[PDB]
C-alpha cells in the first residue's frame, strides 16, 4: 500500500537520523579550537580581463594553470592567457543564453550549454585554423546548468529537469541516467579519482552517485533553501555547498553528517559560487552583495574579504597550483587575485 | 622587451578586439523582449503572424525577429521548460520589456493568470523592468457576453457594484455590456499592477486579437516610452 510504503519510509528515515545522532560524539570546532588562527589575508588584484559585452555566468581553469575560458550572455566564449592578458580564441555560439562552460583536461575540447537544452563540444586542435563544433548532444528536456569532463570521450551533465546523465562523445547516445531528485539541479563536481560525483538541487538536498553502477549512494539534507554551488575537498572525502539562505555548510561522506556552518549576522544575501584552496585551509565564496569573502575552513571565521566588483559575483575558481584565483561578475569583468 | 613570437600574439589579440568592437556596435542597436503566457492564451498565433508579416525536437527556446520603422527587435519564448520559473527568469533581468499575453474569454482560469501576474510583477530580479500586457481574444468575449449563456458575476462578486469609468474610449462603438466587462478585467489587472509600483517601472494595457496587424506598432510605442524614461533617468534630468 502507498500509506504502508510511506510509513516504512518514515520509519527508515527516523532510523537513519538516530544512527547519525549516535555516530556523533564531538564537534569540529571543539577539536580545532586549540589551533593557531590563520589571521588576516591580503589578496590584491593583479590583472583585469576586459572585452566581454554582457554579464559573465561561467568560467573554468585549465590544467596547465595558465589558460582560461569564460562565457557571457552575448553569445561568446573567450580563451584568455592569464599571464599576458591576451585573447587566444573567440567562439561565437548559436544560442545566446549560456550558463555553463568547461575545459577538457587534455586541453583539446571545450563545452557550453544553457537554455537551448543542448550541450555543445568544440574542437580546438584542427588542421584548419578555426574552431568548429564537434558534436551537439540532445536528450534533456529542461535547461542545462553544469557540465564536466571525465576524459576525452565522456561527459557529465546536470539539467533543469531532475536528471543527471553521462554521455558518450563518439556516439551521442546516453549511457546512464541518474534519477531521484525532486527539483532543478544547479551544481556538479567530480571527485579527484573520477569515480564519484556530487550534485546540488533546488530541493535543499545533495546526493552522491557512482558512474559505473549508476545508483544514488547517500543523501544529505541540512539546508533550508536552494543549493547553488558545490565543490570537493582535495582529499576526496568531504564537500562544501552554498545556498540562498546566506549559509555555507561542510559535509563528510564517511560519517554522513554535517561538520560546520559558515554564517554571519551581517550577511543577508545568498551565495553563488564555492571553491576550496589547494590545501583546503581556506574556503572562498562569492555573494550577491558584490563581494567575495574568504573563510577559514577549520575554525569558521572570516579570514579576509575581496571587494573589487560593481555587480553581483557569478563565478569563482582556483588554479591547480594554487598561485591565483579568478572572479567574474555581472559587470563583465574578470579579475585575477594574488 | 618582447620576443618575436610574442609580438605576434598581441596582433592577434588586437584583431580579436576589433571584431569584438564591431559585435558590440551591432549588439547595442537591438532591443530584446521576452514573450510569456499560458498555453490557453494565443501567443503562438501572435508570433506566427509577426513572423509572416515581418521578416529541433526538444528545443527549449525559440527566437523570432521582426523590424518596424528601421529598428530591430528580438522576441524569445520558452517551449520545453518545466513548471518552475524562479531560476531561469534571472537571465532576463536586462531585457527592454516583458510581454504578458492573457486570455479574456475564460472566466474560469482568470484567477490563475492574475496570480501569475503578481508573481511576475513582484519578482526581485524583475524590478525596473516594464510589462506590456495583451488582453487577447476580444471577439470571444464579445460573443459570450452578447449571448448571455454564462455570467461573470458568479466568479467575481464585485462586478455588480462596478461602474464604467469616465475615461473609457470605445473606438469602434459597441454594446455597453462588453465594454463594461472588458474594462472591469483591465481594472483588476491594473489594480494588481499599481498596488506596489513604486515608480520604478510601468504597465501598459492593450486590447487586441491574435490576427491584428497593429501589434508591432504597439510594442514599438511602448519600447519608445521605456527607452525615453531610462534616458531621462540616466542623463541627470530627474
Amino acid at each position: 500500500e502507498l500509506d504502508q510504503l510511506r510509513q516504512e519510509a518514515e520509519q527508515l528515515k527516523n532510523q537513519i537520523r538516530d544512527a547519525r545522532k549516535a555516530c556523533a560524539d564531538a564537534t569540529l570546532s571543539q577539536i580545532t579550537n586549540n589551533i593557531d588562527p590563520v589571521g588576516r589575508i591580503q589578496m590584491r588584484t593583479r590583472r583585469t580581463l576586459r572585452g566581454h559585452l554582457a554579464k559573465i555566468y561561467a568560467m573554468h581553469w585549465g590544467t596547465d594553470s595558465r589558460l582560461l575560458v569564460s562565457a557571457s550572455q552575448d553569445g561568446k566564449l573567450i580563451i584568455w592567457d592569464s599571464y599576458t592578458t591576451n585573447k587566444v580564441h573567440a567562439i561565437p555560439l548559436r544560442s545566446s543564453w549560456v550558463m555553463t562552460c568547461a575545459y577538457a583536461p587534455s586541453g583539446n575540447y571545450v563545452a557550453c550549454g544553457g537554455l537551448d537544452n543542448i550541450c555543445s563540444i568544440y574542437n580546438l586542435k584542427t588542421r584548419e585554423g578555426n574552431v568548429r563544433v564537434s558534436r551537439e548532444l540532445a536528450g534533456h528536456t529542461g535547461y542545462l546548468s553544469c557540465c564536466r569532463f571525465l576524459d576525452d570521450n565522456q561527459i557529465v551533465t546536470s539539467s533543469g529537469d531532475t536528471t543527471c546523465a553521462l554521455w558518450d562523445i563518439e556516439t551521442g547516445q546516453q549511457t546512464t541516467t541518474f534519477t531521484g531528485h525532486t527539483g532543478d539541479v544547479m551544481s556538479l563536481s567530480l571527485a579527484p579519482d573520477t569515480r564519484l560525483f556530487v550534485s546540488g538541487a533546488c530541493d535543499a538536498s545533495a546526493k552522491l552517485w557512482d558512474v559505473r553502477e549508476g545508483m544514488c549512494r547517500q543523501t544529505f539534507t541540512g539546508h533550508e533553501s536552494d543549493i547553488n554551488a558545490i565543490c570537493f575537498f582535495p582529499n576526496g572525502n568531504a564537500f562544501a555547498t552554498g545556498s540562498d539562505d546566506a549559509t555555507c555548510r561542510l559535509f563528510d561522506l564517511r560519517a554522513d553528517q554535517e561538520l560546520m556552518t559558515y554564517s554571519h549576522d551581517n550577511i543577508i544575501c545568498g551565495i553563488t559560487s564555492v571553491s576550496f584552496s589547494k590545501s583546503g585551509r581556506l574556503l572562498l565564496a562569492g555573494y550577491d552583495d558584490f563581494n567575495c569573502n574568504v573563510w577559514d575552513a577549520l575554525k569558521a571565521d572570516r579570514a579576509g574579504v575581496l571587494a573589487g566588483h560593481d555587480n553581483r559575483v557569478s563565478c569563482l575558481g582556483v588554479t591547480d597550483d594554487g598561485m591565483a584565483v579568478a572572479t567574474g561578475s555581472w559587470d563583465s569583468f574578470l579579475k585575477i587575485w594574488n | 622587451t618582447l620576443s618575436a613570437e610574442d609580438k605576434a600574439a598581441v596582433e592577434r589579440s588586437k584583431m580579436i578586439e576589433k571584431q569584438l568592437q564591431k559585435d558590440k556596435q551591432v549588439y547595442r542597436a537591438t532591443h530584446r523582449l521576452l514573450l510569456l503566457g499560458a498555453d490557453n492564451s494565443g501567443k503562438s498565433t501572435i508570433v506566427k503572424q509577426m513572423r509572416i508579416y515581418h521578416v529541433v525536437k526538444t528545443s527549449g527556446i525559440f527566437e523570432t525577429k521582426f523590424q518596424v520603422d528601421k529598428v530591430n527587435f528580438h522576441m524569445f519564448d520558452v517551449g520545453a521548460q518545466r513548471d518552475e520559473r524562479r531560476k531561469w527568469i534571472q537571465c532576463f533581468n536586462d531585457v527592454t520589456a516583458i510581454i504578458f499575453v492573457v486570455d479574456s474569454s475564460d472566466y474560469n482560469r482568470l484567477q490563475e493568470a492574475l496570480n501569475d501576474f503578481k508573481s511576475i510583477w513582484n519578482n526581485r530580479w524583475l524590478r525596473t523592468i516594464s510589462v506590456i500586457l495583451f488582453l487577447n481574444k476580444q471577439d470571444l468575449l464579445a460573443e459570450k457576453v452578447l449571448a448571455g449563456k454564462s455570467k461573470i458575476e458568479d466568479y467575481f462578486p464585485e462586478f455588480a457594484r462596478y461602474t464604467t469609468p469616465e475615461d473609457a474610449t470605445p473606438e469602434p462603438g459597441e454594446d455597453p455590456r462588453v465594454t463594461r466587462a472588458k474594462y472591469f478585467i483591465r481594472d483588476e489587472f491594473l489594480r494588481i499592477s499599481t498596488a506596489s509600483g513604486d515608480g520604478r517601472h510601468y504597465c501598459y494595457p492593450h486590447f487586441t486579437c491574435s490576427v491584428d496587424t497593429e501589434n508591432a506598432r504597439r510594442i514599438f510605442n511602448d519600447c519608445r516610452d521605456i527607452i525615453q524614461r531610462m534616458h531621462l533617468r540616466q542623463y541627470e534630468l530627474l
Epitope: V88, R127, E128, G129 | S3, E5, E11, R12, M15
Partner: single-chain antibody, 232 residues
Framework: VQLVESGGGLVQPGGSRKLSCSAS????????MHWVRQAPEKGLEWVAY????????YYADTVKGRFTISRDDPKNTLFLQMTSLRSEDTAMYYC??????????????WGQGTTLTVSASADIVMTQATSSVPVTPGESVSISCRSS???????????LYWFLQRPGQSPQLLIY???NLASGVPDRFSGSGSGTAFTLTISRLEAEDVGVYYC?????????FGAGTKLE
C-alpha cells in the same frame, strides 16, 4: 590542407615576375605566410613575411627594395612581386604558413615549390656539423647544432626548429621550440639543447628517415637556417 603555387620560368636579367601561392583547405585569413627559397644545391634562406591583417611586413637584407609581398583574403591567394632580377636569385621558392598563439606550431605546412632560372649586420649565425654521416638500418644518430648567441629568452622559451627534407618533396616540420614533436611525426624523434648547443636524436632508423636535416632560429628577424647535414 594543400598549397599550390605557380609563376616560375626563365627570365632575362633586369626583368620582373609575380609569384602566386593559391591556398585551399583551411582558414587563410587567420594565418601568416612566408617565402623561403633554396638554391639548386644549397640550403634554405628566408625571404619575406606577411602578417594576418597585413600589419607587419619583413624583408631580408638582400631583397629589401627589390621584392614586394602582398595578400588578398577574399581570393585566398598570396603574391610576391620581384624587380631587378640578378643572377643570384636563381632558386626554388616555397610557400609556408605559420600561426602564432600560446601553444601554436609555426611552419607546419609547406607547399610544392616553384622553380626560377635567371640566365647569366649582427644577425645570429648558426653552424652545422659535417654534412655527411654514414648510417645503417637499426641504429641511432646524434645530429648537432651550434649558435652564436643564446636563444633562450626571459619567458623560458628556446626558439629552435628542426626540418627534414626527403630526396623528393618539400621539407616537413619535426621539432619546434627545441622540445616539441609536431603532429604526424613518430615518437622516435627527440630533441634537446642547453641554450647554445642543441642536438637531435633518432632512436631507431628506418628506410624513410633518409634526407637532409636543417635548423632554424626564430628569436629575431631575419631567420637564419644553417648549412644542414645529410644522412646516407
Amino acid at each position: 590542407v594543400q598549397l599550390v603555387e605557380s609563376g616560375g620560368g626563365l627570365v632575362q636579367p633586369g626583368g620582373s615576375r609575380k609569384l602566386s601561392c593559391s591556398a585551399s583547405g583551411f582558414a587563410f585569413s587567420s594565418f601568416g605566410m612566408h617565402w623561403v627559397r633554396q638554391a639548386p644545391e644549397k640550403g634554405l634562406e628566408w625571404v619575406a613575411y606577411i602578417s594576418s591583417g597585413s600589419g607587419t611586413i619583413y624583408y631580408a637584407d638582400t631583397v629589401k627594395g627589390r621584392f614586394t609581398i602582398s595578400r588578398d583574403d577574399p581570393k585566398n591567394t598570396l603574391f610576391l612581386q620581384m624587380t631587378s632580377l640578378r643572377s643570384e636569385d636563381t632558386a626554388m621558392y616555397y610557400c609556408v604558413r605559420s600561426i602564432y598563439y600560446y601553444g601554436s606550431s609555426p611552419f607546419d605546412f609547406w607547399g610544392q615549390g616553384t622553380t626560377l632560372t635567371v640566365s647569366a649586420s649582427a644577425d645570429i649565425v648558426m653552424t652545422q656539423a659535417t654534412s655527411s654521416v654514414p648510417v645503417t638500418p637499426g641504429e641511432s644518430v646524434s645530429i648537432s647544432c651550434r649558435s652564436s648567441k643564446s636563444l633562450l629568452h626571459s619567458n623560458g622559451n628556446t626558439y629552435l626548429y628542426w626540418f627534414l627534407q626527403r630526396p623528393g618533396q618539400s621539407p616537413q616540420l619535426l621539432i619546434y621550440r627545441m622540445s616539441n614533436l609536431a603532429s604526424g611525426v613518430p615518437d622516435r624523434f627527440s630533441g634537446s639543447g642547453s641554450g647554445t648547443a642543441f642536438t637531435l636524436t633518432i632512436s631507431r632508423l628506418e628506410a624513410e628517415d633518409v634526407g637532409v636535416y636543417y635548423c632554424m632560429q626564430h628569436l629575431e628577424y631575419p631567420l637564419t637556417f644553417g648549412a644542414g647535414t645529410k644522412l646516407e
